[PDB]
Design a protein around this ligand. Structure first.
Ligand SMILES: CCCCCCCCOCCOCCOCCOCCO
Ligand SMILES: CCCCCCCCOCCOCCOCCOCCO
Ligand SMILES: [Ca+2]
Ligand SMILES: [Ca+2]
Ligand SMILES: [Fe+2]
Length: 675
């Protein structure tokens, strides 16, 4: 007859509420009326965990749902006051004579809304067949699909959330006021420094390479300083293909592309007289970085001056015995010929240095448009938006995936509002501009592939499983294994067979929506449009979580470290690539680099997008307990202690490196894409 209702309120700003809360307990035998949760003094203060003794007029049997109503106080002859938004963490019912019932919530309640909560026990559609519970699932997803809808942003792009401004978003997918404040303070302060220094308003060349060091007065990091110390070095130019900003392109080469006519004579110096180009190709010691996708891309106008982009090809040589990876040849065009020289390290100073810089510029355009924006933001959004629409609150995958979706819809809405719009940093200060970004995404979407998204398949495909000093791989694979083991445990707990995976209609709709809205129903993407086995499910889910956390962390963390010394990552180029050799000079080199304002505007932007604003949410840390059962909680503990072991391994490893790799240290990896 009696019931103890324990309720936890959020600690966030505004989490508390002055409004009155009432609950209706629904059971197999029936539903109770609205029951008040009103004790002496104020309840539902921010961070509060309070008990309420409630009594039901009659029996309800086994508890099924928990309907939570909220209404503002009611003055006689004045009506209600005003809605006071309330964030609820969880409910807990305790009937006689014992046995607790935990109802996880973790969402905002507003106005005359009604929160319907199931017991914390995760349940697939075929888990509990009670019609009251099936009705709850169906009506919930119906509401979700109405709340969060799709729209086409551009042709050939993945679809996105149908919201124009960040203000139109629901509270449940918004930045916390804390995180947002922290973010805008950091930005306003950063912009102020760069602005008052008059650098955002300087149209023209840097007076010298030395003046470019002024960036280190704005912001400063050891890795950024290190880039300036060694940017001219070949080993550093090459190593950044492995442990730098964009470590996903390098791949082993047994057959040199015909449009890249490197001869044995061109590489005889570096390789030595002991072998030849063909011999080393067969050895598997030669690797290639091909920015061909940039070929003929649309370019931007900066300060009324037409900008330029190359689409280079870089041949690299991995010297024996853990020696350095060294560049052999660079061609700055996809079309060979006398007007596109193959530059060697044996060329003069500025020819070779100019050639390398062009490749670094290609890395920028490629990284930010495809590796960062498309792969580490747009696809995670699709995963997020599909998850919200197709997987209900009580579904195991929702419980698993929901922390890895936090703020993703928010940050992307922000980008579409303030990043890739006219007048803003991309349009303003990048070489390829808005149309270039779009054109790249459009091309890449037509040849995307499931294997690149799954790290073990990615490393295998590119044939870089054994290349030394590849820390993005080394650390990335350990984390992937950890996530894969974590996911397989969760799947093993809830899905007893492959048939049980096939019959999950909600799961199949989830994969199908990602395939449709995310990858445009392209079979050539190699991405599943359905999941027929548990093995496939484990891999797919692992790919999602990994993409939303470590992948973004790996390609985001190094942005400022890489761009702070601008010659190491020029956002644009102001002259076309050289057509002859022996023309490059220091004066010409600076004339080719972007103007001061474009330089500092991009650096300002990348510095802000490198750091996770506000409080952190480390990978594998889930303060929101959606999983209330024991078995999933063990899996979380295992996943957490493993990440710690992986971390400690990375500390030891980095301790003996002049330039450590920290971008994949688990404590520094966010659960989701949020910046
Ligand atoms: C139109 C309104 C402009 C307001 C701009 C306010 C300036 C913001 O300053 C942030 C950057 O300044 C850095 C250092 O400022 C001095 C404080 O002391 C530094 C040592 O801790
Ligand atoms: C001075 C400009 C500061 C930039 C603030 C806007 C940030 C909002 O969008 C963030 C999310 O972006 C996702 C993808 O990022 C790729 C952008 O690349 C940087 C271009 O310079
Ligand atoms: Ca409030
Ligand atoms: Ca009270
Ligand atoms: Fe990002």
């Amino acid at each position: 007859a009696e019931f103890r209702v324990r309720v936890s309120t959020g600690e966030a700003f505004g989490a508390g509420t002055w409004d009155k809360v009432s609950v209706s307990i629904v059971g197999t035998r029936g539903e109770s009326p609205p029951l008040p949760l009103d004790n002496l003094g104020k309840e539902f203060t921010a961070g509060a965990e309070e008990d309420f003794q409630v009594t039901l007029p009659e029996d309800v049997g086994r508890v099924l749902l928990l309907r939570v109503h909220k209404a503002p106080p009611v003055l006689p002859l004045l009506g209600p006051l005003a809605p006071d938004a309330w964030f609820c963490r969880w409910f807990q019912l305790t009937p006689p004579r014992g046995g607790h019932l935990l109802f996880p919530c973790y969402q905002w309640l507003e106005g005359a809304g009604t929160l319907v909560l199931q017991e914390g026990t995760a349940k697939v559609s075929w888990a509990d067949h009670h019609p009251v519970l099936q009705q709850q699932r169906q009506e919930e997803l119906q509401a979700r699909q109405e709340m969060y809808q799709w729209k086409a942003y551009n042709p050939g792009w993945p679809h996105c959330l149908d919201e124009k401004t960040v203000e139109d978003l629901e509270l449940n997918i918004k930045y916390s006021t804390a995180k947002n404040a922290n973010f805008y303070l950091q930005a306003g302060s950063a912009f102020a420094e760069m602005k008052i220094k008059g650098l955002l308003d300087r149209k023209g060349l840097w007076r010298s390479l030395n003046e470019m060091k002024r960036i280190f007065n704005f912001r400063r990091t050891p890795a950024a300083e290190h880039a300036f110390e060694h940017w001219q070095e070949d080993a550093f130019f090459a190593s950044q293909f492995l442990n730098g900003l964009n470590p996903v392109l390098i791949r082993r080469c047994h057959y040199l592309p015909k449009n890249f006519p490197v001869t044995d004579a061109m590489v005889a110096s570096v390789l030595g007289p002991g072998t030849s180009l063909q011999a080393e190709l067969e050895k598997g010691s030669l690797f290639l970085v091909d920015h061909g996708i940039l070929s003929g891309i649309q370019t931007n106008v900066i300060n009324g001056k037409p900008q330029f982009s190359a689409a280079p090809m870089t041949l690299l040589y991995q010297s024996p015995g853990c020696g350095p990876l060294l560049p052999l040849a660079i061609q700055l065009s996809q079309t060979p010929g006398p007007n596109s020289p193959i530059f060697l390290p044996t060329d003069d100073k500025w020819d070779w240095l100019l050639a390398k810089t062009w490749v670094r510029n290609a890395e920028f355009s490629f990284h930010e448009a495809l590796t960062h924006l498309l792969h580490s933001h747009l696809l995670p959004e699709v995963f997020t938006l599909a998850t919200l629409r197709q997987l209900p609150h009580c579904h195991p995958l929702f419980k698993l995936l929901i922390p890895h979706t936090r703020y993703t819809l928010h940050i992307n809405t922000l980008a579409r509002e303030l990043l890739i719009v006219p007048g803003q940093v991309v349009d303003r200060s990048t070489g390829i501009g808005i149309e270039g970004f779009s054109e790249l995404i459009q091309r890449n979407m037509k040849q995307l592939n499931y294997s690149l998204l799954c790290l073990p398949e990615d490393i295998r495909t590119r044939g870089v499983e054994d290349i030394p000093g590849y820390y993005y791989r080394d650390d990335g694979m350990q984390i992937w294994g950890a996530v894969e083991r974590f996911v397989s445990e969760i799947i093993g707990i809830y899905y007893p067979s492959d048939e049980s995976v096939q019959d999950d209609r909600e799961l199949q709709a989830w994969v199908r929506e990602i395939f449709s809205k995310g990858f445009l129903n392209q079979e050539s993407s190699g991405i599943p449009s359905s999941l027929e086995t548990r093995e496939a499910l484990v891999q797919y889910v692992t790919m999602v979580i990994f993409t939303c956390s470590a992948k973004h962390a790996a390609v985001s963390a190094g942005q400022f470290d890489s761009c702070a010394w601008m010659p190491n990552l020029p956002p644009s180029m102001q002259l076309p690539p050289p057509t002859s050799k022996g023309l490059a000079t220091c004066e010409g080199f600076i004339a080719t680099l972007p103007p001061v304002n474009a330089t500092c505007d991009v650096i300002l932007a990348l510095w802000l997008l490198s750091k996770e604003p506000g409080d952190q949410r480390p990978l594998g840390t889930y303060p929101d307990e959606h999983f209330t059962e024991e078995a999933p909680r063990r899996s979380i503990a295992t996943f957490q202690s493993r990440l710690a072991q992986i971390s400690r391994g990375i500390q030891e490893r980095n301790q003996g490196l002049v330039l450590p790799y920290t971008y994949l240290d688990p404590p520094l990896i966010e659960n989701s894409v949020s910046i």
